[PDB]
Design an enzyme around this catalytic site. Structure first.
Site, PDB file in Angstrom:
ATOM      1  N   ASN A  35      40.743  48.074  48.646  1.00 13.97           N
ATOM      2  CA  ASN A  35      41.009  47.618  47.291  1.00 13.97           C
ATOM      3  C   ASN A  35      41.996  48.550  46.593  1.00 13.97           C
ATOM      4  OD1 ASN A  35      40.673  45.888  44.946  1.00 13.97           O
ATOM      5  ND2 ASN A  35      39.282  47.435  44.093  1.00 13.97           N
ATOM      6  N   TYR A  69      45.506  42.785  33.623  1.00 15.14           N
ATOM      7  CA  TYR A  69      44.313  43.532  33.968  1.00 15.14           C
ATOM      8  C   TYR A  69      44.072  44.624  32.951  1.00 15.14           C
ATOM      9  CZ  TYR A  69      41.151  46.599  36.659  1.00 15.14           C
ATOM     10  OH  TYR A  69      40.101  47.386  37.069  1.00 15.14           O
ATOM     11  N   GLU A  78      35.579  44.595  32.219  1.00 10.96           N
ATOM     12  CA  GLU A  78      36.773  44.538  33.052  1.00 10.96           C
ATOM     13  C   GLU A  78      37.301  43.100  33.009  1.00 10.96           C
ATOM     14  OE1 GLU A  78      36.517  44.471  37.320  1.00 10.96           O
ATOM     15  OE2 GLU A  78      37.903  46.126  37.573  1.00 10.96           O
ATOM     16  N   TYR A  80      40.551  39.921  33.211  1.00  8.32           N
ATOM     17  CA  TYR A  80      41.676  39.417  33.984  1.00  8.32           C
ATOM     18  C   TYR A  80      42.294  38.190  33.331  1.00  8.32           C
ATOM     19  CZ  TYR A  80      40.205  41.969  38.247  1.00  8.32           C
ATOM     20  OH  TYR A  80      39.892  42.924  39.174  1.00  8.32           O
ATOM     21  N   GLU A 172      46.897  43.344  42.307  1.00  5.52           N
ATOM     22  CA  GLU A 172      45.659  43.790  42.914  1.00  5.52           C
ATOM     23  C   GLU A 172      45.503  43.166  44.294  1.00  5.52           C
ATOM     24  OE1 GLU A 172      41.174  44.755  42.174  1.00  5.52           O
ATOM     25  OE2 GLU A 172      41.753  43.072  40.912  1.00  5.52           O
TER      26      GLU A 172
END
EC number: 3.2.1.8
Length: 185
Positions: A35, A69, A78, A80, A172
């Site tokens: 990741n 992000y 978090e 998006y 990402e």
């Protein structure tokens, strides 16, 4: 606008060649990754920001997101706004849709547990998503009117924290290879 923040995080697997280009520009080539998140934007997010970007190259070979992000704190969120992806379209608990910037996005929430957060520790936190219903054409100037997402999220009980950590237009990836080139302003 001048982006003031450079984001380059990898978990350490594979190669993530992230180039901090001039001004709003950056590139990534990656292979055999775990990741990672690379992007340019702003140290402090704002719910009023219009993000402009141009993805001159969007060429994932597998699983990767071309996406706004960011994080908030108190509470820890978090979030998006996904404009494109590679092999895998991300989803979650469907909350409804929002039309913004010539696209329709599905709204999801997910919850992460035993997962690394912004503060560098394994914990539990909430993810807010807008994910475009189909891949946004890349190569031309695109904007994301974040307030459209912030508002529509609010309509579904999805409220962002008071404390705003960074906000970037990001590449990402998850266990994949490919490249991107993105200019943010």
């Amino acid at each position: 606008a001048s982006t003031d923040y450079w984001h380059n995080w990898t978990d350490g697997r594979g190669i993530v060649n992230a180039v901090n280009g001039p001004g709003g520009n950056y590139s990534v080539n990656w292979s055999n990754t775990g990741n990672f998140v690379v992007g340019k934007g702003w140290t402090t997010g704002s719910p009023f920001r219009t993000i402009n970007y141009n993805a001159g190259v969007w060429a994932p070979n597998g699983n990767g997101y071309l996406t706004l992000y960011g994080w908030t704190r108190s509470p820890l969120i978090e979030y998006y706004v996904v404009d494109s992806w590679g092999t895998y379209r991300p989803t979650g608990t469907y909350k409804g849709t929002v039309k913004s910037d010539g696209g329709t996005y599905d709204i999801y929430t997910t919850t992460r547990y035993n997962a690394p957060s912004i503060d560098g520790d394994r914990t539990t936190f909430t993810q807010y998503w807008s994910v475009r219903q189909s891949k946004r054409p890349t190569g031309s100037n695109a904007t994301i009117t974040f307030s459209n997402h912030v508002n529509a999220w609010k309509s579904h009980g999805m409220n962002l924290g008071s404390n705003w950590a960074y906000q970037v237009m990001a590449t990402e990836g998850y266990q994949s290879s490919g490249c991107s080139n993105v200019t943010v302003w």
